[PDB]
């Protein structure tokens, strides 16, 4: 009974049967939700503007090295000059 | 982030499941990022030096 930043929210959704409905209490973060108009009743901020699709749980969001290599009949020139101020004529090319 | 969360899976429709936050166990704390204070003062100094000329 006394920062806040998060909400112990609830709602009712669809269950395995479209005939039946189910209530579940979850939690959400601030700014993910903004007020509508006692007992606070809230709303997902995205439903006001665009759709929503949950990301897959087994998808790795860690960035790994991705080389960009040239096709056949082309070549990527890299500059080897250390002090390449702006963009000009790089003398040391590979 | 110091929050110790829990996967609460709730079946929506036939197979899909909505993974939400349960009750946070073991205290609640704010997320933070540390930066080496001594190491940052040297980097802001090297930048202002080469911006100078």
């Amino acid at each position: 009974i006394t920062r806040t930043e998060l909400k112990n929210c609830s709602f009712n959704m669809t269950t395995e049967l479209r005939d039946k409905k189910q209530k579940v209490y979850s939690l959400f973060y601030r700014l993910d939700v903004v007020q509508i108009n006692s007992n606070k009743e809230y709303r997902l901020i995205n439903c006001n503007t665009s759709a929503i699709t949950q990301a897959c749980p087994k998808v790795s969001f860690e960035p790994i090295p991705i080389h960009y290599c040239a096709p056949a009949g082309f070549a990527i020139l890299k500059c080897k000059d250390k002090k390449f101020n702006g963009t000009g004529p790089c003398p040391s090319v590979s | 982030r110091p929050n110790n969360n829990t996967r609460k899976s709730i079946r929506i429709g036939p197979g899909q499941a909505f993974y939400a936050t349960g009750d946070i166990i073991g205290d609640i704390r704010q997320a933070h990022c540390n930066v080496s204070k001594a190491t940052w003062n040297e980097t802001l100094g090297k930048v202002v030096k080469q911006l100078r000329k």
Partner: antibody, heavy 129, light 107 residues
Framework: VQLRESGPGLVKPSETLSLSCTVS?????????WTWVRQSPGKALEWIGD???????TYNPSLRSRVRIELDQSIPRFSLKMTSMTAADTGMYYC???????????????????????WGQGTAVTVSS | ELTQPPSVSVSPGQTARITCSGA??????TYWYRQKPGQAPVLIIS???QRSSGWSGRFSASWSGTTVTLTIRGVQADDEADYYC???????????FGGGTKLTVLG
């Protein structure tokens, strides 16, 4: 753990009074914030301000002009001061520790107050010429 | 300007009820302590987590809108002294003091 007062415990109304307290055999004295309290002869407890090895200055707003607390970073000496106001309020002044535990990261607002958990031997102070 | 009563009593071996009313009762929590005459007060109840602190059997606490509830153990015998009450302002600066109730046991 141990903590006992110091000083004379008596003064005339015109001259500033200054007393101290000594903590020892404490596992960690630096982080814990401490404050002093007084008990009027009418058995009405009162609050004077907190202070920290951090160097934080705070007192009761009704006694701001009188009190000015000092600190000793080397060995914990808990000096206290009271200048303009002296008479009537005279009674049993105490020595205490306002224990502090942490629920995470300092300077982030994660240092909840445990409250007063150890006190001093107890001393009495009255004004009478 | 918090308010703690100073004169209530109850029978020994019965549950009692200690209150302390004040508007700055949010970021303040509650102190009380029982100072036996001529002695030093001790921890009435102590915060060892941000959730709650009524684990020990002897005492428990409840929270209302402004008044705070200091419930106590079933037996009220042998332990008697005046119970003060202390808290801190919203700016986390200042500690209010406002008296406390001396309790006497019948029989």
């Amino acid at each position: 753990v141990q903590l006992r007062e110091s000083g004379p415990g008596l003064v005339k109304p015109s001259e500033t009074l200054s007393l101290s307290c000594t903590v020892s055999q404490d596992s960690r004295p630096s982080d814990h914030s401490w404050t002093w309290v007084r008990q009027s002869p009418g058995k009405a407890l009162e609050w004077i301000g907190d202070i920290h090895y951090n160097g934080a200055t705070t007192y009761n707003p009704s006694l701001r002009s009188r009190v000015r607390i000092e600190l000793d970073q080397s060995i914990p000496r808990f000096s206290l001061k009271m200048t303009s106001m002296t008479a009537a309020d005279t009674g049993m002044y105490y020595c205490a520790r306002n224990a502090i535990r942490i629920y995470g990261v300092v300077a982030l607002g994660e240092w909840f107050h445990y409250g007063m958990d150890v006190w001093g031997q107890g001393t009495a102070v009255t004004v009478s010429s | 300007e918090l308010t703690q009563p100073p004169s209530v009593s109850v029978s020994p071996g019965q549950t009692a009820r200690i209150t302390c009313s004040g508007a700055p009762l949010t970021s303040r929590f509650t102190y009380w302590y029982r100072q036996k005459p001529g002695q030093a007060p001790v921890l009435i109840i102590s915060r060892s987590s941000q959730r709650s602190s009524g684990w020990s059997g002897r005492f428990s606490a409840s929270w209302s809108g402004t008044t705070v509830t200091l419930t106590i153990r079933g037996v009220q015998a042998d332990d008697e002294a005046d119970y003060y009450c202390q808290s801190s302002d919203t700016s986390d600066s200042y500690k209010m003091f406002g008296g406390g109730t001396k309790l006497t046991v019948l029989g």
